[PDB]
RNA sequence: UUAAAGGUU
RNA sequence: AACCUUCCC
């Protein structure tokens, strides 16, 4: 019996871009996995075609990290917006675990056609 | 220097194993025996063959290292023999 | 009941048995790898849910063939059939049915699988895994049951035994292509979930021992064309069978199947790189992390042995003569030699030297001293040899002659047995008697005890477990500090000893530490930090008082290595030679109360303290290579600062060139090392503290990661356990915080004493007795599948 | 008493050694094994033949002066 | 191996 | 242990 992923990761806004400084303000559903040493996020969501780079500030502030992204998974959410046609970019680097936990929990928490 | 300069020249890089300089080059082998059915299947005769090549037997000693002619070892008369036998030959061609 | 077996065969036509009584269910005791939000680990369980049926065979004869029906709840049944019917076209898909049946007044789902084995692979690895001598009774099944043995083997004596019966070798051996073909099986399979939108873990539990799967319970779909087969504890726990059972033997073959002849590679190829991608894309496509075949191009430490493991598992293909110094041709005043400019391991793959001098014009005494070092000139000045007399590869013998080595019977002072004698002592039925001798030799000493470094075999880690056993040792070693030294700083305790092979016909190690100044030596320290220098190590053979006749013999290394070696852990090791009340006690005398102190600091603060106490039955002998490159690695983890990335690759190159797999001169005549340790060498005893806890670390974790977890009653080890799972074989990267606890619970309830392969324990009983700490046979468990030795109790 | 019989093979042994018999490589090995076997030994009703077997090696040879040299 | 949490004596 | 609740298929 072993078990994908109990409890749910859950997402915030961020920021992306097509490349360096492209990223304008916030154009991403960013799907993250927070521990209390560094907050480190799993997936990125978008509506927006080809996004490579994207952005977070650190928390210190003085600082942003840029994260390269692969290329783009299609699919459709099903939502009261009808069909979504939406692109998911997995940071280059993410190993078969973090794409199966965002995976799970998107097919489950979700409306996919 | 003529049979180690050939292998050597054949090379990609230059670069060959260790472990094949004396098994392609070297025209002096040595066989180390401990009993007489070892002695059957591998140093057989005058002339046997190993690495791909003919040797030829030249000399025979015991572990006292004194010579013994190819007749003495038999099946019978191997016990009256100090038995890490070494024969060492030349390659031949 | 008749009804119910006309429907699970079905349309099929078999002859279906019922191995369970009736309509109902069959408990059985299988092994499983858990993991839920309560408890995970690898354990055996008792499996009800199944009712199982074997098949016959033409004249009633019974074979492996089962059809394993599943009641379960509507939910599943309707998960596992929209689900199949995605995965239905893979071979390695075991045929389900999906029928509804009427039992007792309500009609009940079933999902009847067809044609399956007794036994999966977890089973298998668990019964080749935690091994215990007389409660076989699985392994034993599972070996008769595939033709690898008959029922009459096990009426042998010590048929388990690696050292006394290396028979047993062969046993496993026809064992091993079962397991090839699962991981070609296994990888169909990741394909097909793949390009079906499938997402799900991947457990050895739904793997019989065809290579079929049949579970799709814990599954989940997306798109087509991204799916994610999570395998992480599949061939981590896989690991160890594959090297055990000698699996990958089918590709020494050409076209790779047993009955065609082996390969005839070139005997000049030294570069298997392409061949290393193409076995590691066959059989371990999914494996997500990156594989670098030449381990010069690894990041640090951690994937130095992530990707040593996988070399390990693929040298075992390519032939021996391959393996060994890269010679070169070079010309210095219009003379040419033959000099080593490279090194190709088994391990780290190909090592080319950054500081080659093509057409020089002189040689320096540094020049002189490395080139004279070297066995290059001397095996290629030498001649062939073939000794019949071991199985270790031999390359050549440097004289005309062999040489029999012969030990002196020891002389006898009759004056103090008189006077021991006239004072009533050694009369009969004395509790006292000699027993320590002085025990002669004839002349085939030393070429006997090289058969026993044949003991030595290649063993395949758990990389994973390694990796979290690696960071929890660690931290046994940080209150210690180290790094490199000038030449002014070496201290030399007897500078009358002998200098190595070549060298020994000059002096003593005096001579060289004169000759050369203080310059000299810090410049051949900054060459070893780029390039590579393999020696010989001459094998001297002892002579000394013991209770049993064995010629021990002893391993005089060379000067050049020494020199360099010192320059590390010379300032690495006086720290740990002057510390007190560390685990380690190197260093500790045992006057002025130094015992009693030892003692009494190892008895700190256990709670229902039981003693305990092991050893190695062949330490230095038949240690694994990967052992050893760990305990070099945390050695070396003391040059964070003096050292950069490729000074420490180099220097680790270095060490594995000259004390582990080098070039002895035994007699006249020069052999290879197949592995183990070098006794003589700088940092023996160290290295085998480190081995000995490392091995500790292991049998603790195997202990916790074994135990049900259902029944342990404390809530805190629970989540310890449920922790320790997801930091194994859930995590890439380390976590300091549960290290830190780890340890801590460690020390809390299992304190060592450590010296060299030598340990004493006091450990908690109640924890030991209920499984939470490692036991005794945990130990044996662990040294039987990582060491290739069996451990009985005339050593515990 | 046993360890009279050990201490004795010790000493022949030793004067075998001295005797320059280690020059014959299966006659050595022969005497190695006694000498060995009679260490190990654990009654004194094998010990003694496999000390007088021992002895016969000495007794064959004629560096030994056997007469001179027991003057008693 | 058996959704979760909470509740009383 | 009895016990019920938002339940859970
Ligand atoms: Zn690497
Ligand atoms: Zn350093």
Redesign the interface.
């Known amino acids: ?4 992923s ?2 749910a990761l859950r997402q915030m806004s961020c920021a992306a871009g097509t490349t360096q400084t492209a990223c304008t303000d916030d154009n991403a559903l960013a799907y993250y996995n927070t521990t209390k ?1 560094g907050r480190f996020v799993l997936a990125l969501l978008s509506d927006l075609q080809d996004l490579k780079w994207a952005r977070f500030p650190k928390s210190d502030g003085t600082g942003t990290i840029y994260t390269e992204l692969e290329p783009p ?3 459709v959410t099903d939502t009261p917006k009808g069909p979504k046609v939406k692109y998911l970019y997995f940071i280059k680097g993410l ?3 973090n ?2 936990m965002v ?2 929990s ?3 928490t979700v409306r ?1 056609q | ?1 003529d049979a ?2 050939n ?2 020249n ?2 990609r890089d ?21 009993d007489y059915n ?1 002695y059957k299947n ?1 140093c057989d005769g005058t002339t046997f063959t ?2 791909s090549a003919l040797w030829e037997i030249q000399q025979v ?1 015991d ?1 006292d ?1 004194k010579i013994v002619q190819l007749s003495e070892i038999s099946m019978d008369n191997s016990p009256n023999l100090a038995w ?1 036998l ?1 024969v ?1 030959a030349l390659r031949a061609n | 009941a008749q009804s119910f077996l006309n429907r699970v065969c079905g349309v099929s036509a078999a002859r279906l048995t019922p191995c369970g009584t009736g309509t109902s269910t069959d408990v059985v005791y299988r092994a ?6 309560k408890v995970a680990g690898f354990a055996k369980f008792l499996k009800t849910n199944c009712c199982r049926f074997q098949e016959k065979d033409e004249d009633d004869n019974l074979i492996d063939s089962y059809f394993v029906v599943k009641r379960h709840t509507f939910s599943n049944y309707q998960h596992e059939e929209t689900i199949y019917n995605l995965l239905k076209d893979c071979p390695a898909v075991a045929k389900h049915d999906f029928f509804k049946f009427r039992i007792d007044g309500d009609m009940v789902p079933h999902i009847s699988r067809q044609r399956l084995t007794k036994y999966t692979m977890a089973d298998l690895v668990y019964a080749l895994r935690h091994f215990d001598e007389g409660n076989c009774d699985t392994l034993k099944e599972i070996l008769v049951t595939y033709n690898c043995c008959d029922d009459d083997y096990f009426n042998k004596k010590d048929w388990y035994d690696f050292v006394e019966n290396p028979d047993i070798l062969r046993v496993y051996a026809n064992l091993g292509e079962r397991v090839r073909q699962a991981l070609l099986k296994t990888v169909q399979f990741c394909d097909a979930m793949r390009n079906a939108g499938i ?3 991947l ?1 050895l539990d739904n793997q019989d021992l065809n290579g079929n799967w049949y579970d799709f319970g ?1 599954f ?4 087509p064309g ?1 799916g ?6 599949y061939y981590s726990l896989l690991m160890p069978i594959l090297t055990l059972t000698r699996a990958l033997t089918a590709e020494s073959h050409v076209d790779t199947d047993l009955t065609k002849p082996y390969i005839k590679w070139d ?2 190829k ?1 570069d298997f790189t392409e061949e290393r991608l193409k076995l590691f894309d066959r059989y371990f496509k ?1 494996w ?2 990156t594989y670098h075949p030449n381990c010069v191009n690894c990041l640090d430490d951690r994937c130095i042995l992530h990707c040593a493991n996988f070399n390990v598992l693929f040298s075992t293909v390519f032939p ?10 070079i010309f210095v005043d219009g003379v ?1 030699f ?1 000099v ?3 090194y ?1 391991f088994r391990e780290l793959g190909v090592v080319h030297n950054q500081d080659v001098n093509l057409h020089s014009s002189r040689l320096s005494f540094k020049e002189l001293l490395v080139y004279a070092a070297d ?2 000139m001397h ?2 000045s ?8 071991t199985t270790c ?1 031999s ?3 440097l004289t ?3 040489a ?1 080595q ?1 030990v ?5 002072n ?1 004056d103090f ?1 008189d006077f021991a004698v006239s004072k009533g002592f ?1 009369k ?1 039925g004395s509790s006292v ?2 027993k320590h ?8 000493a030393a070429i006997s005890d090289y058969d026993y470094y044949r003991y030595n075999l290649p063993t395949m880690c758990d990389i994973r477990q390694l990796l979290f056993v690696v960071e929890v040792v660690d931290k046994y070693f940080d209150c210690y500090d180290g790094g490199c030294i000038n030449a002014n700083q070496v201290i030399v305790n007897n500078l009358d000893k002998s200098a190595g092979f070549p060298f020994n016909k000059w002096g003593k190690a005096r001579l060289y530490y004169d000759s050369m100044s203080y310059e000299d030596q810090d410049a051949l320290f900054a060459y070893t930090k780029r390039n590579v220098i393999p020696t010989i190590t001459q094998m001297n053979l002892k002579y000394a008082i013991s209770a049993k ?1 064995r010629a021990r013999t002893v391993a005089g290394v060379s000067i050049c290595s020494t020199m360099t070696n010192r320059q590390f852990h010379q300032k690495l090791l006086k720290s740990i030679a002057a510390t007190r009340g560390a685990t380690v006690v190197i260093g500790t005398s045992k006057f002025y109360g130094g015992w009693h102190n030892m003692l009494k600091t190892v008895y700190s603060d256990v709670e229902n303290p039981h003693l305990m106490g092991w050893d190695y039955p062949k330490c230095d002998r038949a240690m694994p290579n990967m052992l050893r490159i760990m305990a070099s690695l945390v050695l070396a983890r003391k040059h964070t600062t003096c050292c950069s990335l490729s000074h420490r690759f180099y220097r680790l190159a270095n060490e594995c060139a000259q004390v582990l797999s080098e070039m002895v001169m035994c007699g006249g005549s020069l052999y ?1 090392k197949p592995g183990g340790t070098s006794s003589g060498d700088a940092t023996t005893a160290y290295a085998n503290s480190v081995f000995n806890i490392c091995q500790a670390v292991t049998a603790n974790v195997n202990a916790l990661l074994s135990t049900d977890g259902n029944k342990i009653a404390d809530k805190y080890v629970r989540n310890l356990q449920h922790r320790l799972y997801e930091c194994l074989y ?1 995590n ?1 990267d380390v976590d300091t ?1 549960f290290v830190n606890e780890f340890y801590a619970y460690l020390r809390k309830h299992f304190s060592m004493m450590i010296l060299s392969d030598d340990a004493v324990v006091c450990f908690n009983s109640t924890y030991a007795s209920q499984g939470l700490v490692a036991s005794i046979k945990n130990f044996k468990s662990v040294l039987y599948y990582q060491n290739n030795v069996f451990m009985s109790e005339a050593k515990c | ?1 046993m ?1 009279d019989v ?2 004795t093979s ?2 022949l ?2 004067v075998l ?1 001295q005797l320059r018999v ?1 020059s014959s ?1 299966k006659l ?2 022969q005497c ?2 006694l ?2 076997d009679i ?2 030994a654990k009654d004194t009703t094998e010990a003694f033949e496999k000390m007088v077997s021992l002895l016969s090696v000495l007794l064959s040879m004629q560096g030994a002066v056997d007469i001179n040299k027991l003057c008693e």
């Open positions: 019996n072993n078990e994908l109990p409890v040493g998974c299609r699919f190993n078969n675990l794409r199966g995976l799970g998107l097919a489950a996919l | 220097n180690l300069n292998i050597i054949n090379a230059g670069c060959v194993p260790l472990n094949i300089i004396p098994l392609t080059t070297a025209a002096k082998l040595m066989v180390v025996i401990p070892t591998t190993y690495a000693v572990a290292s890490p070494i060492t | 499983f790898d858990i993991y839920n939000d997402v799900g873990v457990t814990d989940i779909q997306t798109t991204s994610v087969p999570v395998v992480d504890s005997l000049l030294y999914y997500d992390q021996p003569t391959s393996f060994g110094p890269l010679v070169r041709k040419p033959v080593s400019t490279g190709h066995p290059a095996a290629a030498g001649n062939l040899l073939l000794d019949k007399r590869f390359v050549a013998a005309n002659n062999v029999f012969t002196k019977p020891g002389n006898f009759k047995y050694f009969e008697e000699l001798f002085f025990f002669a030799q004839d002349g085939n006749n290879v859930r890439r915080d | 008493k360890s050990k201490c010790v000493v042994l030793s050694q280690e490589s050595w090995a190695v094994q000498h060995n260490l190990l």
